Amino acid sequence: RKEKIIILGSGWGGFNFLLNIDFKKYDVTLISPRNYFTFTPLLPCLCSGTLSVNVCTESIRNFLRKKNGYCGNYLQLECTDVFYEDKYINCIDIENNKVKLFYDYLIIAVGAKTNTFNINGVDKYAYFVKDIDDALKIRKKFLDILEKCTLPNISNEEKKKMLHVAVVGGGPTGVEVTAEFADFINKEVKINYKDIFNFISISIIEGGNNLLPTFTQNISDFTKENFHNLNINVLTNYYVIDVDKHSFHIQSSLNKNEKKKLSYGLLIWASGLAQTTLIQKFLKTIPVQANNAILKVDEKLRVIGIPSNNIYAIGDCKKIQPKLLHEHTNEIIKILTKLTSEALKLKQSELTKTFPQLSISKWDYEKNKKGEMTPQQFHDYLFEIDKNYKSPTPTAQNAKQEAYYLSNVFNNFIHTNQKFNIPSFIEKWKGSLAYIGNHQVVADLPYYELKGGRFSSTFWKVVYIQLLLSWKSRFHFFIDFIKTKWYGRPFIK
Amino acid sequence: RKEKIIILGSGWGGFNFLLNIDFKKYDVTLISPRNYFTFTPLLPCLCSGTLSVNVCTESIRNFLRKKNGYCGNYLQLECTDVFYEDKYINCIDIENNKVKLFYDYLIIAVGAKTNTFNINGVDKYAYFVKDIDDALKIRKKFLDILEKCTLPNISNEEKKKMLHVAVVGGGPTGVEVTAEFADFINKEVKINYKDIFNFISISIIEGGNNLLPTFTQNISDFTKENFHNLNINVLTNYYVIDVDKHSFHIQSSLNKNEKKKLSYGLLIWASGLAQTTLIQKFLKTIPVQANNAILKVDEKLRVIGIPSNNIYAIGDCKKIQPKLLHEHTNEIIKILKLTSEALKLKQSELTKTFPQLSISKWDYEKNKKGEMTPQQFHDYLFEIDKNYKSPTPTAQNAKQEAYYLSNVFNNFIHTNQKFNIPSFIEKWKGSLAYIGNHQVVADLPYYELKGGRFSSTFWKVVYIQLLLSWKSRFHFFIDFIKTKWYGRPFIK
Ligand SMILES: Cc1cc2nc3c(=O)[nH]c(=O)nc-3n(C[C@H](O)[C@H](O)[C@H](O)COP(=O)(O)OP(=O)(O)OC[C@H]3O[C@@H](n4cnc5c(N)ncnc54)[C@H](O)[C@@H]3O)c2cc1C
Ligand SMILES: Cc1cc2nc3c(=O)[nH]c(=O)nc-3n(C[C@H](O)[C@H](O)[C@H](O)COP(=O)(O)OP(=O)(O)OC[C@H]3O[C@@H](n4cnc5c(N)ncnc54)[C@H](O)[C@@H]3O)c2cc1C
Ligand SMILES: NC(=O)c1ccc[n+]([C@@H]2O[C@H](COP(=O)([O-])OP(=O)(O)OC[C@H]3O[C@@H](n4cnc5c(N)ncnc54)[C@H](O)[C@@H]3O)[C@@H](O)[C@H]2O)c1
Ligand SMILES: NC(=O)c1ccc[n+]([C@@H]2O[C@H](COP(=O)([O-])OP(=O)(O)OC[C@H]3O[C@@H](n4cnc5c(N)ncnc54)[C@H](O)[C@@H]3O)[C@@H](O)[C@H]2O)c1
Ligand SMILES: [Mg+2]
Ligand SMILES: [Mg+2]
Ligand SMILES: [Mg+2]
Ligand SMILES: [Mg+2]
Ligand SMILES: [Mg+2]
Ligand SMILES: [Mg+2]
Ligand SMILES: [Mg+2]
Ligand SMILES: [Mg+2]
């Protein structure tokens, strides 16, 4: 008779919600086709053999018994439909048997998938890099190619075509995967495959001018410089537009007329995100959202358009559409002293609990001061703040923070003295890191920039050994680096 | 213009030959469809998640440069034919492209495969345990089943049938794989799957009366006792005769007409050896060996029936057929009045020619004979010949053969010792087995281990020395810490 919370997904959102939700207060079931949590930041290290599967993983069933003594459940299913009207979901097991399950609360955390842009042959020929098996598939293919090119039944020009590694995407994923392959190629591969080492080349391809565009221009320039010193072909300002079995095509971003055909052996696709079929389906089911491209939620992470307000979504599968300021103008006016921008800002602490977009991290009050306004003008101003609101970026950092917010809201606000005092979710940006090869780490932190150096790696390791969610994983983190330092990357495939 | 040695296979034989063969003296190429060496004794620990792949493995290319500066080569191919007349072999890559290669010496070390005994459904439905991939497939299937049986769309009756693990074979492989699963089931699985744990059962099936037949009766009895304490169904004196998708059939060894149909979820097949298709093919190519079931070699490991004497075989793919004593009677008489004790007295030196004369191959005291006539001596010699047993198909023997033969190439073949090449004689060092719940058994010369608090410690001290790199020793040590402090993983 405890209320049932179903969690869909075992990713950063779902798993972290699981870790914090009170199993005494609720009856909790996580549902996911994947029986482990994947620690995605270390996924590129898996591509090169620097770290093991154990450090990139947490098994869900190890976290189903909290110290209180009460338990949670886990089912290995893939949710295929949500029926918000009747409070249930349809799933399928791995043998396509339907399973029907009821909930009182649904926490959707199914994440996003890799975007092919409908380009011909991305699904067919390219390797994605979004989970454990993806990374392992990529490692093996690479090692497979190395062995195939050591055979005598092969010409030097066949070798040059096949030993070309193309990475599409100059975001952090693409950049880190390239970096890691570069280290592998310049170390272990160089030693054990000398006769063919010089036919090997890596290219990274990016539509815009900069690698790591969302970081900072100095970090971008440094990343490109460092890539040059590693003899990585940096093909920025190029868009991949077609993919065939042995070659792909690129179009210059600077001249629409300039195309190139490139040979390749291994093609890694690390472009942006796209929605799961479950989300596409679910959207059609909600009158208000029937033609949305992504699932929209409250400022409280409630899925808009559900009469019951019993479905939440966290992580990559959702954008936040908060309660509009300009729909509550008069009410906000009463709350104030004047009627200036800094009248508003003076009450920004209190009003931020209701409107996230009022946050000093969401609205620049100084780049936008406004002298005394008439009510209508104030309403226009409020409207600008509304339009300026940016939904949290699709990162593990945000998914984790959303997961702790929401679970704590279930633990401490719903079904307690505070049912109505629930604050709206606001991220704190903690910074971003990236490995860019050859011991060089970059970090774009709130008050710092790292641009390489002897102690860059050290900073990276102190950061991530603390972001790991178990002592088991910390053990492996430590051991795996010793092993890689003393003995090297492995060639088992 | 260095002579070319081609090694076929990257197992205990091939890899250890590679480790010791002098790359300065020869131009060596190992050919194997598998680019790593598999440390098979720890393979059952891989089934249960106790140890990792890193401790069961060595990557061939890490060993292609010895410290003197000379190199070896490796090619990822599967040999499909040997043409002994013309000294070349045909291979195929993984995309079925033919490759043709010339050698001066061929070292065949392709091992053996699992024997299905042609039984319907073994290949189709059963899991084998001969390599890394096998162990991981086995591990996954089990975890798959546990998850499937936690679903609601499943009856307790379906659960009981699906969560039955049957292991066919009471040899050390079968026994060790059963033990490891028992440990996993009784620890990590019991904690994380309380609801369905009592639907789980393990059976081991063995045709003879004993588990670990080739050990000791005390060790066999102790292994069976320990198995019952763990609630493993020990179905000795049963053999499997048929296999279907959800059930298999067994026949009593004690009553020809008692049969049983058993349901199962996971069927593991560890029944003993059979020959590779390469060896079957190659045999038909050798006139004197054309109807053999197994490849026979000299007492010097040279494949018999080859005019050039440039093809060797080591490991599980071969049996030794030594030079016959009774074909050399008169000569032996001349070396030596004319008793078994006379013969034994010269046994150390004659053993360099005939391995069957070894005190480890022939019981001189249980077979003493007084003065013989030449004819009688000839008959005696003949008994020694027929008593000879080829090395048992073990890693221990494949390794010892590989060190012997590589040492012959290094220090005999192109030196002034060409003619004093001694015949190969194993030295048995003992055998160990993990039998679950921390109990190790060992059947050593002069000792028997039957369990104990310090049983496991002995096992760990032995195998950390048997590992062939410091890398692997690191992982050996670390993997046991990991398993102790944090437990076995459920990743699949
Ligand atoms: C290589 C890589 C490196 C990254 N590094 C960083 C980083 O350093 N910092 C950072 O902030 N972010 C990083 N990210 C981004 C981060 O992984 C995502 O933002 C994060 O995964 C969002 O979490 P999520 O729970 O929404 O989705 P996921 O973590 O992808 O989880 C989705 C889960 O839903 C499951 N699922 C899918 N379909 C269904 C279905 N219909 N039913 C039930 N379950 C389903 C999946 O199995 C999965 O378990 C990285 C991403 C990648 C790919
Ligand atoms: C689970 C298990 C545990 C064991 N434990 C022990 C133990 O504790 N002690 C002990 O003494 N023995 C043990 N053994 C036995 C030991 O593994 C074998 O006796 C040993 O492998 C024999 O070595 P080999 O080189 O002849 O064959 P393998 O080690 O099997 O090597 C054969 C190699 O040949 C390759 N190959 C196959 N076909 C071809 C082809 N056509 N062309 C080229 N290469 C080919 C294979 O890929 C493989 O690399 C165990 C065996 C198993 C399965
Ligand atoms: N180290 C970190 O902190 C880290 C690491 C990985 C991911 N993340 C987060 O995960 C999310 C996704 O990251 P991501 O790297 O996979 O995607 P991304 O959107 O950040 O980068 C994709 C890049 O590929 C380009 N692109 C798209 N289609 C292309 C084409 N056809 N040809 C060439 N270039 C093309 C885009 O211009 C874009 O710059 C991001 O929000 C990111 O911040 C963070
Ligand atoms: N711990 C160790 O030292 C160790 C471990 C594994 C293997 N080995 C060596 O590797 C070789 C192979 O060992 P193995 O265990 O794989 O095979 P095995 O030959 O030693 O034993 C197989 C057993 O299964 C039985 N069997 C065969 N077909 C059957 C059927 N249809 N139904 C029921 N029982 C059936 C046989 O009676 C036999 O005892 C051996 O030489 C062994 O010594 C040693
Ligand atoms: Mg999730
Ligand atoms: Mg994840
Ligand atoms: Mg999500
Ligand atoms: Mg996602
Ligand atoms: Mg071999
Ligand atoms: Mg082997
Ligand atoms: Mg062999
Ligand atoms: Mg074999």
Side-chain angles (χ1 to χ4, degrees), chain A residues 173-337 339-364:
Chain A
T173 297
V175 162
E176 293 181 331
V177 170
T178 307
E180 279 284 356
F181 269 108
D183 284 355
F184 199 23
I185 289 166
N186 293 323
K187 208 198 202 57
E188 284 87 2
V189 179
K190 191 185 197 200
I191 292 171
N192 305 274
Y193 298 86
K194 281 158 15 206
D195 282 319
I196 67 177
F197 166 81
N198 278 291
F199 300 149
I200 302 172
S201 63
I202 320 183
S203 302
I204 184 171
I205 295 86
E206 158 64 35
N209 188 26
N210 309 144
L211 309 174
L212 307 176
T214 90
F215 274 67
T216 103
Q217 190 58 231
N218 271 345
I219 288 182
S220 289
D221 296 336
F222 181 57
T223 312
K224 176 178 283 178
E225 292 187 22
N226 195 233
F227 268 14
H228 290 326
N229 300 345
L230 291 173
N231 291 110
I232 295 159
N233 302 306
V234 181
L235 278 54
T236 41
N237 289 97
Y238 277 106
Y239 273 115
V240 168
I241 64 188
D242 179 66
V243 179
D244 199 28
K245 183 146 170 290
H246 294 282
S247 66
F248 63 93
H249 284 96
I250 53 171
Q251 184 171 356
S252 168
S253 293
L254 299 181
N255 178 9
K256 38 155 248 185
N257 288 27
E258 184 186 19
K259 299 180 217 308
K260 288 168 141 178
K261 176 192 151 304
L262 292 165
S263 277
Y264 79 96
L266 170 52
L267 176 59
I268 291 150
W269 205 264
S271 67
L273 309 173
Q275 296 311 298
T276 60
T277 73
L278 171 69
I279 292 295
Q280 286 161 334
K281 281 192 192 160
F282 179 45
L283 283 189
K284 296 179 196 293
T285 284
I286 310 158
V288 209
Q289 309 206 45
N291 304 88
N292 290 353
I294 193 157
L295 183 72
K296 291 161 60 185
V297 289
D298 268 347
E299 73 280 352
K300 289 177 183 193
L301 302 188
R302 290 136 61 208
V303 175
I304 295 161
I306 310 297
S308 292
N309 298 324
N310 61 340
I311 305 184
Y312 291 74
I314 62 179
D316 292 354
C317 71
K318 66 91 185 59
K319 258 55 184 167
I320 295 178
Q321 242 295 317
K323 172 187 289 189
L324 299 165
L325 289 160
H326 79 273
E327 257 154 27
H328 293 79
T329 316
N330 308 280
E331 331 183 8
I332 289 160
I333 291 174
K334 296 181 161 124
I335 299 197
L336 272 48
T337 85
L339 200 52
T340 71
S341 95
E342 281 223 26
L344 178 57
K345 179 172 177 176
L346 276 165
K347 259 55 182 312
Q348 170 272 355
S349 190
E350 164 169 17
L351 283 160
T352 264
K353 283 174 272 166
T354 295
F355 306 94
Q357 62 274 52
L358 284 175
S359 185
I360 67 178
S361 74
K362 290 285 185 201
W363 178 252
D364 205 325

Side-chain angles (χ1 to χ4, degrees), chain B residues 186-254:
Chain B
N186 287 319
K187 208 202 205 58
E188 290 87 3
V189 180
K190 190 182 197 195
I191 291 172
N192 298 264
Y193 302 84
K194 290 169 313 174
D195 291 344
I196 68 181
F197 167 83
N198 282 290
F199 297 152
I200 300 171
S201 57
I202 312 196
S203 309
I204 184 167
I205 324 299
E206 159 65 25
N209 179 245
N210 305 144
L211 306 180
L212 306 177
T214 82
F215 279 66
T216 280
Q217 190 53 235
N218 274 342
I219 286 180
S220 299
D221 295 333
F222 181 64
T223 306
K224 175 179 278 184
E225 291 190 29
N226 197 233
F227 269 16
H228 308 278
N229 299 339
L230 303 177
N231 288 285
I232 298 158
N233 287 278
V234 182
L235 282 61
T236 38
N237 286 114
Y238 277 106
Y239 39 83
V240 176
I241 62 183
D242 183 71
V243 179
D244 194 27
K245 190 173 133 188
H246 291 274
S247 67
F248 64 92
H249 281 99
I250 62 175
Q251 194 177 350
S252 172
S253 291
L254 296 186

Side-chain angles (χ1 to χ4, degrees), chain B residues 389-459:
Chain B
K389 287 145 193 59
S390 167
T392 53
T394 72
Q396 201 178 111
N397 281 336
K399 182 184 193 171
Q400 281 173 40
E401 290 169 13
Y403 268 87
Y404 155 84
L405 186 52
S406 57
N407 189 264
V408 160
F409 276 98
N410 286 347
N411 298 283
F412 288 80
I413 295 295
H414 281 320
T415 62
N416 52 8
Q417 288 274 41
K418 340 194 34 183
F419 321 94
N420 322 324
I421 296 176
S423 69
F424 172 76
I425 322 186
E426 332 89 84
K427 182 175 178 287
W428 179 58
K429 318 270 185 66
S431 303
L432 302 78
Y434 185 62
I435 67 167
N437 198 30
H438 298 96
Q439 308 310 307
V440 174
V441 299
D443 174 13
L444 311 162
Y446 307 127
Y447 310 102
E448 300 186 36
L449 241 166
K450 299 166 295 185
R453 170 145 253 175
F454 295 107
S455 201
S456 58
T457 324
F458 176 71
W459 183 98

Side-chain angles (χ1 to χ4, degrees), chain A residues 9-13 31 33-34 40-41 79 109-111 278 315-316 394-397 464:
Chain A
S10 49
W12 276 95
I31 294 169
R34 198 184 70 184
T40 58
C79 174
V110 287
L278 171 69
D316 292 354
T395 70
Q397 201 180 108
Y464 277 111

Side-chain angles (χ1 to χ4, degrees), chain B residues 48-289:
Chain B
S48 63
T50 301
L51 300 181
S52 70
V53 174
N54 299 292
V55 71
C56 300
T57 275
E58 301 288 357
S59 304
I60 301 306
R61 299 203 170 272
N62 288 333
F63 297 79
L64 287 184
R65 305 156 312 277
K66 293 195 212 304
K67 306 339 164 182
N68 60 39
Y70 295 78
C71 296
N73 306 119
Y74 165 68
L75 302 175
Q76 196 183 244
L77 306 165
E78 157 190 340
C79 173
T80 53
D81 299 284
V82 177
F83 291 85
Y84 67 93
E85 275 172 64
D86 305 293
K87 287 183 176 199
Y88 74 88
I89 56 159
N90 289 347
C91 298
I92 54 178
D93 55 19
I94 203 173
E95 284 171 325
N96 275 264
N97 299 311
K98 176 185 298 178
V99 181
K100 156 165 177 177
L101 292 168
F102 288 100
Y103 64 84
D104 294 308
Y105 298 95
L106 188 57
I107 317 288
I108 306 174
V110 291
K113 61 184 185 204
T114 319
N115 193 351
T116 70
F117 307 103
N118 301 297
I119 298 180
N120 313 338
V122 176
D123 279 297
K124 189 170 183 173
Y125 298 116
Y127 290 81
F128 297 133
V129 216
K130 262 201 72 81
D131 224 325
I132 305 294
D133 278 314
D134 294 341
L136 299 181
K137 275 186 184 182
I138 282 170
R139 189 183 159 279
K140 175 158 186 295
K141 177 60 157 175
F142 182 62
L143 303 174
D144 276 346
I145 288 167
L146 289 170
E147 289 303 325
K148 180 172 170 184
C149 284
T150 289
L151 302 184
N153 47 285
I154 309 292
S155 69
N156 292 13
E157 181 65 14
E158 300 169 69
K159 288 183 188 179
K160 284 185 275 178
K161 296 187 184 152
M162 283 187 295
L163 289 165
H164 176 217
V165 180
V167 179
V168 183
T173 296
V175 162
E176 293 189 315
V177 174
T178 304
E180 282 286 342
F181 268 115
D183 282 357
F184 193 21
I185 285 169
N186 287 319
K187 208 202 205 58
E188 290 87 3
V189 180
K190 190 182 197 195
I191 291 172
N192 298 264
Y193 302 84
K194 290 169 313 174
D195 291 344
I196 68 181
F197 167 83
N198 282 290
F199 297 152
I200 300 171
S201 57
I202 312 196
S203 309
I204 184 167
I205 324 299
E206 159 65 25
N209 179 245
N210 305 144
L211 306 180
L212 306 177
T214 82
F215 279 66
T216 280
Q217 190 53 235
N218 274 342
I219 286 180
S220 299
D221 295 333
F222 181 64
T223 306
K224 175 179 278 184
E225 291 190 29
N226 197 233
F227 269 16
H228 308 278
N229 299 339
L230 303 177
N231 288 285
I232 298 158
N233 287 278
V234 182
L235 282 61
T236 38
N237 286 114
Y238 277 106
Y239 39 83
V240 176
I241 62 183
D242 183 71
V243 179
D244 194 27
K245 190 173 133 188
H246 291 274
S247 67
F248 64 92
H249 281 99
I250 62 175
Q251 194 177 350
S252 172
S253 291
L254 296 186
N255 183 350
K256 32 152 282 179
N257 340 201
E258 193 192 29
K259 293 172 177 43
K260 280 169 185 193
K261 195 186 78 192
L262 272 38
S263 279
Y264 78 97
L266 173 54
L267 180 62
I268 289 155
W269 204 265
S271 63
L273 308 173
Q275 296 308 302
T276 61
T277 57
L278 172 73
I279 289 298
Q280 289 172 87
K281 277 190 205 160
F282 177 47
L283 286 177
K284 290 178 178 177
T285 286
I286 308 167
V288 82
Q289 303 208 45

